[PDB]
Symmetry: C5
Subunit: 103 residues, 5 copies
Amino acid sequence: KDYPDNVMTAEMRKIAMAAVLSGMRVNMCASPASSPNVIWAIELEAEGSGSGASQFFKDNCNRTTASLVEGVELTKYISDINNNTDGMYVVSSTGGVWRISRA
Amino acid sequence: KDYPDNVMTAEMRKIAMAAVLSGMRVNMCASPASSPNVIWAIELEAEGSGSGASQFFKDNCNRTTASLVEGVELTKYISDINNNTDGMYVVSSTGGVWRISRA
Amino acid sequence: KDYPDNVMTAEMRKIAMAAVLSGMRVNMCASPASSPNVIWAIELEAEGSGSGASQFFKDNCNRTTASLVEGVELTKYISDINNNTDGMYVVSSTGGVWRISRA
Amino acid sequence: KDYPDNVMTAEMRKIAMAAVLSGMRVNMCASPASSPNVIWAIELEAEGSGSGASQFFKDNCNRTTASLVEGVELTKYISDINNNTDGMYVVSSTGGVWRISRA
Amino acid sequence: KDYPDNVMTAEMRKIAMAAVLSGMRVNMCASPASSPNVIWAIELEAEGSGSGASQFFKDNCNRTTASLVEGVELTKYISDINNNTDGMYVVSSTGGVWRISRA
């Protein structure tokens, strides 16, 4: 709930929901230290076909414990206020689940 | 009022509103036998021909006393400030009414 | 000034701006007690061949001094900070002026 | 900085953005006592249907020192944080430039 | 974190967002040397009337030690909560990479 990460993770949900409504692809930097894999960096794309992740975005995720996913389609955006499942989530066309971070 | 359910409950509104404006359905995990019922969990879907609701959303509504409703068109969005009717409500194409939980 | 009403009025405004840009009409629970009439509740419809306000929206309204006004086509949307028109105002295609409450 | 005027100036930035992403013309109440003329009130006009500010929007301005501007196109939205040019700005098709008040 | 540069930089986030979902182009007053290149002023432009920056926009950028960039088509929108890479970023069709100021 602290500056500056509240605004970043806020854009995340904006990117999240924008992906789901517009159909636009994303790239994620997603920690495998949790199931679902919490997302750490998300990159909404408009253009660049098979050529997904920007070089910039790649360079900041190999440095990282996280993995990296390109050209994902986000067809479901989820919110849950039960406690044992509290938190944002995004699902792919391929039925893969990610938690969105929170800060 | 408080963080973090100020996040997911504002996300519930942003999800509700998207669906009412866009036409895209939602799947809820909602109270069943009340007026209004209350959503404990929503998912905003687009394409999604491998599942009405994603299995991530199904399973998590099987860990709850509440019940899973899926494929629902919402066609109205109510913001209300009178005394004992203050809150957020959505209506479905077929008359169902929910409250959008606040916190 | 304060929660939760801040969340509602905010939504009132989103609904306001939403009806202007899309055509989608609204139903209002309106105070003739001021001029222009202050908006106490707004329903936002996508729906169909309208029938009209949702029964839930009418029941809350008729428990109040407010007059119901239904299926209005909002064409103008104002923000004004002149020291006597200090507030928000939607304008219906019929001339009608409605303040958007604040809290 | 403070309530409720933050809300209206906030709308302006949302009304401004709505105007440019949309080209629905606007109506302005602006004070030439500055340059760019600072935006004291704006009206987002949709099914204006041959253009024309609302009698209500007009009246509010004629009673103030500002000056009414009608039928105008917004094509550029500017955010700037340069030390001598901190502020928000909108530009028309006729090259005209207005400043958006801050709150 | 303070007033009034968060209002602005937030509106930089929205312009940046908007140009990415809509294909609109922006012109940018940013630092000259920088990798990534931090944004000091962004202008969202529907058109195209006159291609390129607005005269207003130009003159606030010549006065500063900053680069004017004109008609950049943004392609990626990176919300990053990275440890070495925290903040928000956009990417241009040319693989240019701009940090969006925070405040």
